[PDB]
Amino acid sequence: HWGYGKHNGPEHWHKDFPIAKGERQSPVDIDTHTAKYDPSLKPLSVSYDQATSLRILNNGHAFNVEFDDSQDKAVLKGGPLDGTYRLIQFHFHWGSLDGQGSEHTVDKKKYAAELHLVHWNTKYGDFGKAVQQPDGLAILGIFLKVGSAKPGLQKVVDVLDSIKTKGKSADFTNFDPRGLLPESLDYWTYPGSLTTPPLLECVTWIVLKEPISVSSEQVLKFRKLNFNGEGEPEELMVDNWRPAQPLKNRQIKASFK
Ligand SMILES: [Zn+2]
């Protein structure tokens, strides 16, 4: 019964998921004055030409755009990573107000939203096996600010009415996740966790410095989604973000000078 409400939000998750207080929790604040350039980092390689989106699902916590991950169709490589990581889904976290919504922060700045493209390490065979490994996942995080519309997001926006409530899914084929990337692939990276229960410490985080712009109308449509199921009291799906967690014995590395 974890969530983002008045009585089940992030500050409560540790009772059922004690790693919530662990050594490698996410998100974190990215201090641009202490993150150090690492010349040994490599460009990243985002290969989404062959991506097969399948479906979009309201899971009661966010919505996931799901992909075929039964081949190396959409992979992330390079950067801080060893080996190959398959895209399985992307989702967002967002606010009730434009001044909030992101999970990671940059010098304490909150963005309006944050996109997570989730990939699993093919060495481990399946996502469920991967989340049990410290190097099981690579999550590419992208900040959203409110300004211009993002044309490549509109198809997502326009399907949300069909998945308003928890448990609803819709066919969602032929979506191109390249339309959600900023121009630059400069990034910060650090080791951390899933930001939702079970909060497993299995993630190499790769957070892009350049935000994307979305329009106020696009974010407004995200804020019409519901946490609840159909036939239940309406609870708008807003403020589905976990706040920054202690960095502890970690360093954030920058790919850029
Ligand atoms: Zn996420």
Q: Is 34 annotated as a binding residue?
A: no
Distance of CA 64 from the midpoint of ligand 1 (Å): 10
Among the listed residues 233, 238, 229, 209, the one whose alpha carbon sits nearest the alpha carbon of residue 62? 238
Q: b/e per residue, 26-45, with b = 16+ CB within 10 A?
A: bbbbbeeeebeebeebeebe
DSSP state of 37: E
Q: Is 14 annotated as a binding residue?
A: no
- Cite the active site residues: 61
Distance of CA 135 from the midpoint of ligand 1 (Å): 17
Among the listed residues 136, 140, 221, the one whose alpha carbon sits nearest the alpha carbon of residue 182? 140
Distance of CA 114 from the midpoint of ligand 1 (Å): 8
Yes or no: say if 88 and 69 are a contact pair by the CB < 8 Å rule. Answer: yes
d(CA 239, CA 248): 25
Distance of CA 106 from the midpoint of ligand 1 (Å): 17
**Residue with the two structure tokens 């390249």:** 178
Q: Which two tokens stand for residue 163?
A: 């998945």
Yes or no: say if 215 and 154 are a contact pair by the CB < 8 Å rule. Answer: no
Find the largest Cα–Cα distance for the chain.
54
Among the listed residues 139, 150, 155, the one whose alpha carbon sits nearest the alpha carbon of residue 103? 139
| Resolution in angstrom units | 0.9
Is the dihedral angle over the CA atoms 76, 81, 83, 88 positive or is it negative?
Answer: negative
d(CA 172, CA 87): 15
Start-to-end CA span in the chain (Å)? 43
Q: Cite the DSSP H helix spans in 24-88.
A: none
**Residue with the two structure tokens 């996502």:** 127
DSSP state of 244: P
Yes or no: say if 78 and 138 are a contact pair by the CB < 8 Å rule. Answer: no
The experimental technique behind this entry is X-ray
- Residue 140 forms beta bridges with which residues? 117, 206
Yes or no: say if 77 and 45 are a contact pair by the CB < 8 Å rule. Answer: yes
Among the listed residues 187, 109, 141, the one whose alpha carbon sits nearest the alpha carbon of residue 26? 141
Which residue numbers come right before each break in the chain (C to N over 2.5 Å)?
none
Distance of CA 71 from the midpoint of ligand 1 (Å): 23
Q: Is 116 annotated as a binding residue?
A: yes
**Cα separation values, 119 from 82, 131, 142, 146, 152, Å:** 13, 10, 14, 26, 20
d(CA 84, CA 74): 10
Q: Is 1 annotated as a binding residue?
A: no
Q: Is 195 annotated as a binding residue?
A: yes
Q: b/e per residue, 9-24, with b = 16+ CB within 10 A?
A: ebeebeeebebbebeb
d(CA 89, CA 67): 6
